[PDB]
Structure 1
Amino acid sequence: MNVIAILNHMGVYFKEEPIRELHRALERLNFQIVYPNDRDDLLKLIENNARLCGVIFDWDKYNLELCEEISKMNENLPLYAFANTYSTLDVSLNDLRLQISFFEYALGAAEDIANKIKQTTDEYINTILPPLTKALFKYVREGKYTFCTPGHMGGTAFQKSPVGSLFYDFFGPNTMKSDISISVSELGSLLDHSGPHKEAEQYIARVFNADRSYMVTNGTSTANKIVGMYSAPAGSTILIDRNCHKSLTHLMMMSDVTPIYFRPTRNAYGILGGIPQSEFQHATIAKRVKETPNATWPVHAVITNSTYDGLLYNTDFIKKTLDVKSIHFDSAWVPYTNFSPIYEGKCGMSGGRVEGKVIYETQSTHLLAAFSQASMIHVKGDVNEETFNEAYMMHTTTSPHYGIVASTETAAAMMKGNAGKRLINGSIERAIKFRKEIKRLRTESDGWFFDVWQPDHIDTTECWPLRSDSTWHGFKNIDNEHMYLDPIKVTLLTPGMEKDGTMSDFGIPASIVAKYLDEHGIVVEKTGPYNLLFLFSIGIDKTKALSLLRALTDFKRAFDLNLRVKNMLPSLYREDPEFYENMRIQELAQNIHKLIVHHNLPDLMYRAFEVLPTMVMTPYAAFQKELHGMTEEVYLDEMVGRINANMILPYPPGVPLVMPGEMITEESRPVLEFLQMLCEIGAHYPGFETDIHGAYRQADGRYTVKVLKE
Structure 2
Amino acid sequence: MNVIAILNHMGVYFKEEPIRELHRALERLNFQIVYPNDRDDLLKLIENNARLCGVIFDWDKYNLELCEEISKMNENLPLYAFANTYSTLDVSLNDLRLQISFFEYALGAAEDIANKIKQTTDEYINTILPPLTKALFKYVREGKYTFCTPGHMGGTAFQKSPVGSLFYDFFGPNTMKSDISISVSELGSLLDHSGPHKEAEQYIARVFNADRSYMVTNGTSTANKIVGMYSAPAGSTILIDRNCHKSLTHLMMMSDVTPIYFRPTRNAYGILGGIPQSEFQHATIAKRVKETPNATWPVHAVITNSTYDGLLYNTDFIKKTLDVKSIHFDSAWVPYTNFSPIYEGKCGMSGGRVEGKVIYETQSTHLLAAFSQASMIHVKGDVNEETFNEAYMMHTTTSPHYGIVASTETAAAMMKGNAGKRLINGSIERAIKFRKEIKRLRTESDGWFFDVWQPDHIDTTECWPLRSDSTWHGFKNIDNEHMYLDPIKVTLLTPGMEKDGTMSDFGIPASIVAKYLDEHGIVVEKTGPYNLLFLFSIGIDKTKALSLLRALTDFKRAFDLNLRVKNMLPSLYREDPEFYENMRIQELAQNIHKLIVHHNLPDLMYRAFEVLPTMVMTPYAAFQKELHGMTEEVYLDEMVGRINANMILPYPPGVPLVMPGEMITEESRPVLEFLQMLCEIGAHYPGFETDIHGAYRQADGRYTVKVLKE
Please classify the TM superposition score into its range, dividing by the shorter chain length: over 0.9
Q: CA deviation at 1:147?
A: 4.0
Per mean C-alpha deviation after superposition, the further-off stretch among 161-170 and 282-291 is: 161-170
- Matches of 1:358 and 1:314, distance apart in 2: 18
Q: How does 1:48-127 map to 2 (within 5 A)?
A: 48-90=48-90, 93=93, 96-127=96-127
- Matches of 2:663 and 2:233, distance apart in 1: 27
SS in 2 for 1:411: helix
Q: CA deviation at 1:266?
A: 1.4
| Contact preservation (8 Å) 2:17, 2:107 | no
Q: CA deviation at 1:657?
A: 0.7
SS in 2 for 1:578: helix
Residues 94 and 297 of structure 1: CA distance in aligned 2, closer, same or farther (over 3 Å): farther
Map Cα deviations across residues 211-242 of structure 1 (whole Å, 9 max, x no partner). 11111111111111111111111111111111
Q: CA deviation at 1:413?
A: 1.1
Residues 95 and 482 of structure 1: CA distance in aligned 2, closer, same or farther (over 3 Å): farther
SS in 2 for 1:418: helix
Q: CA deviation at 1:87?
A: 2.1
- Matches of 1:375 and 1:430, distance apart in 2: 28
- Matches of 1:548 and 1:151, distance apart in 2: 47
Q: CA deviation at 1:542?
A: 2.1
- Matches of 1:570 and 1:594, distance apart in 2: 24
Q: CA deviation at 1:145?
A: 2.1
Name the % identity: 100
Residues 1:307 and 2:294 aligned together? no
SS in 1 for 2:261: strand
| Contact preservation (8 Å) 1:340, 1:421 | no
Map Cα deviations across residues 184-237 of structure 1 (whole Å, 9 max, x no partner). 111101111111111111111111111111111111111111111111111111
Which residue in 2 is equivalent to 1:460?
Answer: 460
Q: CA deviation at 1:149?
A: 3.0
Q: CA deviation at 1:13?
A: 2.0
Q: CA deviation at 1:674?
A: 1.3
Per mean C-alpha deviation after superposition, the further-off stretch among 62-71 and 86-95 is: 86-95
Per mean C-alpha deviation after superposition, the further-off stretch among 562-571 and 164-173 is: 164-173
- Matches of 1:649 and 1:8, distance apart in 2: 68
Residues 55 and 459 of structure 1: CA distance in aligned 2, closer, same or farther (over 3 Å): farther
Map Cα deviations across residues 279-304 of structure 1 (whole Å, 9 max, x no partner). 11111111111111222111111111
Q: CA deviation at 1:643?
A: 0.5
Residues 20 and 686 of structure 1: CA distance in aligned 2, closer, same or farther (over 3 Å): same
Unmatched runs of 5 consecutive residues or more in structure 2: none
Q: CA deviation at 1:269?
A: 2.2
Residues 632 and 94 of structure 1: CA distance in aligned 2, closer, same or farther (over 3 Å): farther
- Matches of 2:384 and 2:354, distance apart in 1: 17
Map Cα deviations across residues 88-130 of structure 1 (whole Å, 9 max, x no partner). 4455545543211111111221101111122211111101101
Map Cα deviations across residues 658-703 of structure 1 (whole Å, 9 max, x no partner). 1111111122121111111111111111111111112112344321
- Matches of 1:92 and 1:533, distance apart in 2: 53
Residues 510 and 90 of structure 1: CA distance in aligned 2, closer, same or farther (over 3 Å): farther
Which residue in 1 is equivalent to 2:327?
Answer: 327
- Matches of 1:42 and 1:487, distance apart in 2: 32
Which residue in 2 is equivalent to 1:587?
Answer: 587
- Matches of 1:694 and 1:96, distance apart in 2: 67
Map Cα deviations across residues 60-110 of structure 1 (whole Å, 9 max, x no partner). 222212222211211111111212232244555455432111111112211
Map Cα deviations across residues 519-575 of structure 1 (whole Å, 9 max, x no partner). 011112221110112222222222211111111111111111101000000111111
| Contact preservation (8 Å) 1:565, 1:580 | yes
SS in 2 for 1:320: helix
Unmatched runs of 5 consecutive residues or more in structure 1: none
Map Cα deviations across residues 142-167 of structure 1 (whole Å, 9 max, x no partner). 21123433233222333343322222
Residues 684 and 236 of structure 1: CA distance in aligned 2, closer, same or farther (over 3 Å): same
- Matches of 2:88 and 2:246, distance apart in 1: 66
- Matches of 1:568 and 1:43, distance apart in 2: 45
Residues 96 and 530 of structure 1: CA distance in aligned 2, closer, same or farther (over 3 Å): farther
Which residue in 2 is equivalent to 1:210?
Answer: 210
Map Cα deviations across residues 453-506 of structure 1 (whole Å, 9 max, x no partner). 111121321110111111111110000100000001111110111122111111
Q: CA deviation at 1:411?
A: 0.6
Map Cα deviations across residues 327-375 of structure 1 (whole Å, 9 max, x no partner). 1111100101101111111111111111111111111111111110000
- Matches of 1:90 and 1:607, distance apart in 2: 77
Which residue in 2 is equivalent to 1:642?
Answer: 642
| Contact preservation (8 Å) 2:467, 2:478 | yes
| Contact preservation (8 Å) 2:21, 2:108 | no
- Matches of 1:607 and 1:356, distance apart in 2: 40
Residues 690 and 104 of structure 1: CA distance in aligned 2, closer, same or farther (over 3 Å): same
- Matches of 2:93 and 2:655, distance apart in 1: 58
| Contact preservation (8 Å) 1:211, 1:381 | yes
- Matches of 2:223 and 2:89, distance apart in 1: 54
SS in 2 for 1:140: helix
- Matches of 1:675 and 1:261, distance apart in 2: 24
- Matches of 1:461 and 1:96, distance apart in 2: 33
| Contact preservation (8 Å) 1:71, 1:96 | no
Map Cα deviations across residues 160-182 of structure 1 (whole Å, 9 max, x no partner). 43322222111111110111111
Per mean C-alpha deviation after superposition, the further-off stretch among 217-226 and 145-154 is: 145-154
- Matches of 1:43 and 1:77, distance apart in 2: 12
Residues 582 and 93 of structure 1: CA distance in aligned 2, closer, same or farther (over 3 Å): farther
Residues 342 and 94 of structure 1: CA distance in aligned 2, closer, same or farther (over 3 Å): farther
Per mean C-alpha deviation after superposition, the further-off stretch among 459-468 and 139-148 is: 139-148
Count of residues in Structure 1 that have an aligned counterpart in Structure 2: 710
| Contact preservation (8 Å) 2:314, 2:345 | yes
Which residue in 2 is equivalent to 1:163?
Answer: 163
- Matches of 2:665 and 2:91, distance apart in 1: 81
Residues 683 and 96 of structure 1: CA distance in aligned 2, closer, same or farther (over 3 Å): farther
SS in 1 for 2:302: strand
SS in 2 for 1:707: strand
Residues 675 and 101 of structure 1: CA distance in aligned 2, closer, same or farther (over 3 Å): same
Per mean C-alpha deviation after superposition, the further-off stretch among 255-264 and 535-544 is: 535-544
Which residue in 2 is equivalent to 1:201?
Answer: 201
- Matches of 2:386 and 2:61, distance apart in 1: 60
Residues 1:545 and 2:545 aligned together? yes
Map Cα deviations across residues 45-64 of structure 1 (whole Å, 9 max, x no partner). 11111111111111222221
Residues 1:174 and 2:189 aligned together? no
- Matches of 1:651 and 1:630, distance apart in 2: 28
Residues 642 and 92 of structure 1: CA distance in aligned 2, closer, same or farther (over 3 Å): farther
Residues 90 and 683 of structure 1: CA distance in aligned 2, closer, same or farther (over 3 Å): farther
- Matches of 1:443 and 1:271, distance apart in 2: 29
Q: CA deviation at 1:12?
A: 2.1
Residues 92 and 332 of structure 1: CA distance in aligned 2, closer, same or farther (over 3 Å): farther
Q: CA deviation at 1:398?
A: 3.1
- Matches of 2:55 and 2:693, distance apart in 1: 59
| Contact preservation (8 Å) 2:370, 2:411 | yes
| Contact preservation (8 Å) 1:464, 1:485 | yes
SS in 2 for 1:15: helix
SS in 2 for 1:253: helix
- Matches of 2:460 and 2:385, distance apart in 1: 44
TM-score by length of 2: 0.98
SS in 2 for 1:272: coil
Q: CA deviation at 1:379?
A: 0.6
Q: How does 1:323-402 map to 2 (within 5 A)?
A: 323-402=323-402
- Matches of 1:457 and 1:245, distance apart in 2: 36
Per mean C-alpha deviation after superposition, the further-off stretch among 320-329 and 67-76 is: 67-76
Which residue in 1 is equivalent to 2:618?
Answer: 618
Residues 288 and 380 of structure 1: CA distance in aligned 2, closer, same or farther (over 3 Å): same
Map Cα deviations across residues 363-417 of structure 1 (whole Å, 9 max, x no partner). 1111111110000001111111232111100111231110111101111111111
| Contact preservation (8 Å) 1:679, 1:701 | no
Per mean C-alpha deviation after superposition, the further-off stretch among 520-529 and 362-371 is: 520-529
Per mean C-alpha deviation after superposition, the further-off stretch among 534-543 and 133-142 is: 534-543
